[PDB]
Design a protein around this ligand. Structure first.
Ligand SMILES: [Cl-]
Ligand SMILES: [Cl-]
Ligand SMILES: [Cl-]
Ligand SMILES: [Cl-]
Ligand SMILES: [Cl-]
Ligand SMILES: [Cl-]
Ligand SMILES: [Cl-]
Ligand SMILES: [Cl-]
Ligand SMILES: [Cl-]
Ligand SMILES: [Cl-]
Ligand SMILES: [Cl-]
Ligand SMILES: [Cl-]
Ligand SMILES: [Cl-]
Ligand SMILES: [Cl-]
Lengths: 162, 160, 162, 159, 160, 161, 161, 162
């Protein structure tokens, strides 16, 4: 089970969201590491994490932050690996700040952005799977079964009065 | 060889999506560009998405505005990564576009980029970052692209 | 006869859409209710929309939240009137749902109602206003519904208890 | 025959609402068009709404901007389906118009469409989708409209 | 003497509008309270507005939420000053209420206050400021209300 | 009889606030107009508010944009009714103006009108409704203003040419 | 030695502004904390601002919600740096507070921080970053606060706990 | 003497940040101005921030648009006060810029000013209010600026002036 995804977040308070990303990676049998890496409070460590990611065997980085969420964009500035950004739902502005701070990157350094909150955490994992499946048969199979399952679940339960 | 499918809901999106295509050309990445309407050509859209993998595509980049459903619906019908570009809408300046693309519930992801030209450029660059993993020439091209933009700023520090 | 199809992207929408169904029952309008996911069951969605007219449906009421594509994609595949109900999302309180539904470009319309339960109820009542033109029992039932809600306000004019 | 009432809050709304009327013309749907202000002509508004059904109208399409009350207040006074078109306001780009029309509490519905010209067009097309059940030529005109818009995109795939 | 009409779109608005009525009581201003639904009782609404002046009302205070049409529609049918209170809506936190009331085009004004209880309270205080010119007792009651809220803060500088 | 004070934070607001003054002229209501800056002339703003009532004013109409503090701060310093006009700001289209005026907490009210010229016109008309109960000529003028605007619509029902 | 004035429009802002005071205490910075309402005590607010420099204050931190005018109005009446903290309003979650503080037109600046407790804490830290220039003990306290927060994240990399 | 560093993410920010520099010029405040991109020149940004205090800078004014990370990331790497100017973006009129700058979590502050030109001017004036404590000539210049702006309004009370 090779470690192919780095899941990183600006603070421990982002874990209730980011754990849902790790849960999907676990369910899909994808190897990952999870770490608190703060753009603001540990900037030098953030640069190091990004700089070394490729040589460490990582293929995708998933980064979550809230508020003025700079972590995903700053990582993306320092690696050519694909970076996925998860806007963590802020208590004040409901992740609207997080979302704009991540998605509105000017041209040159992209961050793939997903839905605010847990929906986006889970979707970032599934999207990472969608990238990794091209060179990992186990992942292709696990992702296909995931999608087959979610389709089957709706088809088998059509009546909402159940 | 055609590895990226660049699609958009209408011809009016071309002024945005052309910038995505310009980057793929610059990086030596094969692509096709096509108008595919989720609302006006729903059957073609389903067929496009269903056949993408077997036609050799590795990534789909989809642009739409307003109630922008094209990226999410293509994503529902292919296992390939789909990148969504919110097109700047005349009434709400892409606010509608962005929310309609990015706020996908858990299960079917769409990787979303900035509203407008910025997003169209970054989706192309992100596609390059997916494709570089198995293509040396693309890794080199993307590395050079980044060096070029870095150099442009470093060699032009005085804003006057 | 079944004249209205009430559909929703997920079972989590039933707490909103059951309020639609409650009004159709009160007005004696025939309907079916079903979970039809635009993202997880896209094929069934197309099939449902494609055949609704030949099945005898005259209106479709479709609820969805977040990036809410169900109403619009149904409307792309049927010439029947499609009524869209934006389900109140947990992050953005239905703002995403509303914009995702109402901001349809010219060519394929979706009639949109208020976010949440209010919209669900109103879609049912709007369906009644479409169907009363060829059904006298529905006309009477709607006239009575409107007369009763008017009486309720009039019967209790001063809200002070003391 | 006149089956659609197209009303608007002020003459300044006509650059938007004319786009509704153009689609109605194209589909062969008879209509009347009038300026009916909720705030400047409230009695005329109530009168218009009250008699619409008895005058043979089947659908009312109402456009207004800003604090846009015309659609909702018409809907309050007719049992006919009322379609609401939020006009693009100069200050807030129709966000006021949109919320003022779509956010009706339970009991009196207004079917709401996109802000601006897009919603004006879509209101016309939705009126057609209501009227097609009882009218063959309208059913035909709407089928042909949809077929032609689909063909136009299929014929023009290269941007 | 009943000089202020306090009206509201539904009974559920009473939790907000009660706060308006409380201030009018504290200032010794006569008022009436009534549920008047723009949408469910439109004829009653027109009759309320048409007869207000002849009934001796001087100010109307109208609360409503969502697509809040009551204040504007009353203002269209009376030349009396109409104060609007956007009631805090469950979905959009009164943003719909606020725009629906404040964004009246030129011709028929509605004086608009804060969303929720704050605005309800302030509409009552503003009614007092309109009426003060015609009654020394209301003028004194309002001056005293202000004097008291000022003294309450000066006397309590320490938040600790 | 100068009964209404029309004030604004800056000269750049005059294109909006002149429309308020135009209605007051049309209705025969006496007024004065002045540039009074809450941030650049705070002392003058306090003095203006403090002395309004003794100077004969009955209503103050105040326009400002951005972080629009003039209406609320004038209302803090006079017992007279204050009418606030959110001026359309260049960056946020008067969203900032509107929230900065209307969202006064309980205790000190400001009657707020629509963003821009619409609000400026409507503040003047609202001032007229406050004052009409005082001069039969103002009541008549306001009633005529409404009749004329109604007549423009009733006599011109067809938007098509 | 009292160098920072921490003021707020109402006592209900204390659960937010207390977090500012906690940081100033931890950094050893002298402060005073007072309720000063721009709308209910406008004269006191003018006098506070006018005499702040005389009283030895170097920075003023001002919190307010809703139509939040306290920071801008203090800034109009002192040349001392004024830091604005937008308090989280119950209706609009501090959006009104934020726009009312930050969108000051050119001429009278207010340094604005995040909505709510994060902004209260940051205003205190920012005040420290002003005072460190002429106070070596404050320079050292701030440097260590930042080293402490950095070390804590570095020592706790694992989000499981 | 150079006491203020004025930096901006891109040359397109100059039409806004030039207004900051104009005020600094008018007040007699020494500054330097440079394009420093958080995303395209991250190492240079870090270097600029790290060395600012030892180069004799006392205040940094940073402007950026969109997902505006420059001010926060500079603030993470210097103990000096950082002033943030949200540049008015084409799409979202600086709403993204503003949230990206002002919504910094606790620990690393950025003093934020109004969106656009107003904020650039105000950042310059706020820098002056920091520097006035140890620079007599700056104190005099800022006092004169405030007196003049007050005078201008007092001397032009009638908006009908022509
Ligand atoms: Cl570090
Ligand atoms: Cl097709
Ligand atoms: Cl689309
Ligand atoms: Cl399916
Ligand atoms: Cl959906
Ligand atoms: Cl209207
Ligand atoms: Cl009634
Ligand atoms: Cl209402
Ligand atoms: Cl002065
Ligand atoms: Cl102001
Ligand atoms: Cl006082
Ligand atoms: Cl305040
Ligand atoms: Cl660099
Ligand atoms: Cl940046």
């Amino acid at each position: 089970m090779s470690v192919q995804v780095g899941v990183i977040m600006g603070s421990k308070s982002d874990w209730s969201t980011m754990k849902e990303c790790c849960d999907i990676l676990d369910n899909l049998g994808i190897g990952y590491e999870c770490e608190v890496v703060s753009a603001h409070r540990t900037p030098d460590k953030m640069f190091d994490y990004a700089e070394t990611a490729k040589e460490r065997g990582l293929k995708v980085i998933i980064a979550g932050a809230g508020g003025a969420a700079h972590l995903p964009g700053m990582v993306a500035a320092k690696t050519t690996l694909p970076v996925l950004g998860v806007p963590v739902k802020s208590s004040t502005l409901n992740g609207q700040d997080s979302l704009l701070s991540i998605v509105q990157m000017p041209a040159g350094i992209p961050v793939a952005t997903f839905a605010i909150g847990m929906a986006g955490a889970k979707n970032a994992a599934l999207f990472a799977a969608s990238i990794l499946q091209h060179t990992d048969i186990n992942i292709a199979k696990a992702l296909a079964e995931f999608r087959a399952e979610q389709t089957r679940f709706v088809l088998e339960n059509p009546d909402p009065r159940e």
